[PDB]
Amino acid sequence: SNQKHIDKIQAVIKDVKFAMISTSNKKGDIHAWPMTTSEVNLDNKEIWFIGDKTSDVVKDIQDDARIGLTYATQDEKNYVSISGDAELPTDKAKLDELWSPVYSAFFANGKEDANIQLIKVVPHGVECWLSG
Amino acid sequence: SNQKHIDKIQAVIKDVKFAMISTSNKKGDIHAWPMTTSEVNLDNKEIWFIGDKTSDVVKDIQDDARIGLTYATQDEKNYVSISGDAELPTDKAKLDELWSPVYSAFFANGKEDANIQLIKVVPHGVECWLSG
């Protein structure tokens, strides 16, 4: 929570295509979904995703903001587990910053699309197993 | 919970070196650890690991048996998320079946070592994202 391998961890996260974000539902069960990380700044304690308001992950976060992210590199040599609190902000300014031509495709009404939901993860702990 | 891509999913799990097992701690936070799957039989609703009694994952499971497993293939083309209930049995018969020369190494007193803890995951839901 207050120390570093941050350099290499952020390196590992930029390398991995999909985070597995795990959440707990009203019955307390854990489920995960793969998602592409839009931004990772560990010094500012911020991991950002662009989600859908209709998604299960957003549904679960609305009742329980305590989430987990995990990242595995394709060489199977590096793993990261983050424990964090997920927020559901509306921030046009921020959405603009995170926007790509990928998203302009799969969101019928672009940056004004009602289904867009930014997810801000504020990590409070990070464990990792790096090689080597 | 009552249907199949079980064939290919078990195939995907045999292919992946480490599951990320996520658990929730007394404060409700989620944390994950990488672990090698000792056995996967989805028809019998059984995923087995050999853990350590001193481990955090076992600690968390003792108070909250509701866990998550995720598996990502190194080609980044296949992902599996399992929601499950973890049990902490003592079963010599079963330990014998799951035993390898790897474990004989890193457990000072072998199959009689006090630190051994079998973990049985009984899945109740599986989602996956396969290609393609």
Side-chain angles (χ1 to χ4, degrees), chain A residues 1-3 5-7 9-13 15-25 27-76 78-91 93-132, chain B residues 1-3 5-7 9-13 15-25 27-76 78-91 93-132:
Chain A
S1 307
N2 313 311
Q3 74 203 344
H5 273 308
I6 291 171
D7 16 61
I9 290 184
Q10 275 187 236
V12 164
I13 296 181
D15 222 8
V16 167
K17 187 159 176 170
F18 293 114
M20 296 299 293
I21 179 164
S22 301
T23 66
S24 35
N25 66 11
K27 176 151 171 141
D29 294 335
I30 289 159
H31 296 94
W33 298 263
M35 288 183 75
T36 43
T37 313
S38 300
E39 189 188 321
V40 59
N41 181 338
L42 296 187
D43 278 3
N44 285 37
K45 300 182 184 155
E46 261 175 10
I47 310 168
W48 289 96
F49 300 86
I50 293 168
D52 222 90
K53 292 187 185 172
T54 59
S55 67
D56 281 330
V57 63
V58 169
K59 191 186 82 147
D60 288 356
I61 292 171
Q62 250 126 14
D63 286 321
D64 189 335
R66 314 202 276 289
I67 71 66
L69 299 166
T70 74
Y71 290 91
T73 53
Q74 57 196 3
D75 73 340
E76 294 197 307
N78 304 264
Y79 299 85
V80 173
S81 170
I82 288 156
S83 187
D85 303 297
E87 282 165 26
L88 297 177
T90 296
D91 194 328
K94 189 76 212 174
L95 191 72
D96 282 299
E97 197 203 293
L98 309 182
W99 202 254
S100 295
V102 201
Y103 303 114
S104 214
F106 317 161
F107 265 126
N109 291 260
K111 295 187 199 110
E112 303 87 359
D113 202 287
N115 255 278
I116 286 165
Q117 178 63 72
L118 290 176
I119 300 170
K120 190 190 184 186
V121 178
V122 178
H124 55 77
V126 181
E127 298 297 305
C128 70
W129 298 262
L130 309 197
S131 309
Chain B
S1 307
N2 313 311
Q3 74 203 344
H5 273 308
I6 291 171
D7 16 61
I9 290 184
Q10 275 187 236
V12 164
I13 296 181
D15 222 8
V16 167
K17 187 159 176 170
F18 293 114
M20 296 299 293
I21 179 164
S22 301
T23 66
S24 35
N25 66 11
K27 176 151 171 141
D29 294 335
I30 289 159
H31 296 94
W33 298 263
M35 288 183 75
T36 43
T37 313
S38 300
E39 189 188 321
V40 59
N41 181 338
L42 296 187
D43 278 3
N44 285 37
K45 300 182 184 155
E46 261 175 10
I47 310 168
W48 289 96
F49 300 86
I50 293 168
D52 222 90
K53 292 187 185 172
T54 59
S55 67
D56 281 330
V57 63
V58 169
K59 191 186 82 147
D60 288 356
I61 292 171
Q62 250 126 14
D63 286 321
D64 189 335
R66 314 202 276 289
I67 71 66
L69 299 166
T70 74
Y71 290 91
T73 53
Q74 57 196 3
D75 73 340
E76 294 197 307
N78 304 264
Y79 299 85
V80 173
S81 170
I82 288 156
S83 187
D85 303 297
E87 282 165 26
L88 297 177
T90 296
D91 194 328
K94 189 76 212 174
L95 191 72
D96 282 299
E97 197 203 293
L98 309 182
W99 202 254
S100 295
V102 201
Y103 303 114
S104 214
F106 317 161
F107 265 126
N109 291 260
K111 295 187 199 110
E112 303 87 359
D113 202 287
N115 255 278
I116 286 165
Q117 178 63 72
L118 290 176
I119 300 170
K120 190 190 184 186
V121 178
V122 178
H124 55 77
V126 181
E127 298 297 305
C128 70
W129 298 262
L130 309 197
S131 309

